[PDB]
Design a protein around this ligand. Sequence first.
Ligand SMILES: Nc1ncnc2c1ncn2[C@@H]1O[C@H](COP(=O)(O)OP(=O)(O)O[C@H]2C[C@H](n3ccc(=O)[nH]c3=O)O[C@@H]2CO)[C@@H](O)[C@H]1O
Length: 124
Amino acid sequence: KETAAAKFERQHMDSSTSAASSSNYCNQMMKSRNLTKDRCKPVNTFVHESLADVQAVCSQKNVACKNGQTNCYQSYSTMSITDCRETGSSKYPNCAYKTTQANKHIIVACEGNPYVPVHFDASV
Ligand SMILES: Nc1ncnc2c1ncn2[C@@H]1O[C@H](COP(=O)(O)OP(=O)(O)O[C@H]2C[C@H](n3ccc(=O)[nH]c3=O)O[C@@H]2CO)[C@@H](O)[C@H]1O
């Protein structure tokens, strides 16, 4: 089916905007991208920069992955991001999220050939 690269774009990419859309961006975005279908995805990050800018991060600052792997990279520049965190009040299937806009360095895990992002590890 959909490649790991493809999944990363659907789960974390959103160039169409510049900042945290609205207070209900995560509620909408999380639902639109299919991350609340089988269970309220607890935490998810959408990045607002060109696909090219994000792909570029795979050749930037090599840093250790949270899982101990060495295939993670941190962006030299900060990027516009929107963090989506599940509210406690949240209730499957009515997954609810808090929306937080920030400008930070992202850390992603890359794999394959081409060497592209397949996992969002962290923002710092
Ligand atoms: N070093 C590495 N560590 C982990 N996985 C690695 C890897 N290198 C490659 N892979 C591969 O990527 C696939 C997709 O990764 P995930 O299933 O974690 O999907 P998300 O990033 O959407 O889901 C993750 C990231 C997201 N998250 C976490 C923190 C945050 O700031 N933002 C955010 O979006 O929350 C979820 C849990 O933390 C894996 O199956 C694996 O094969």
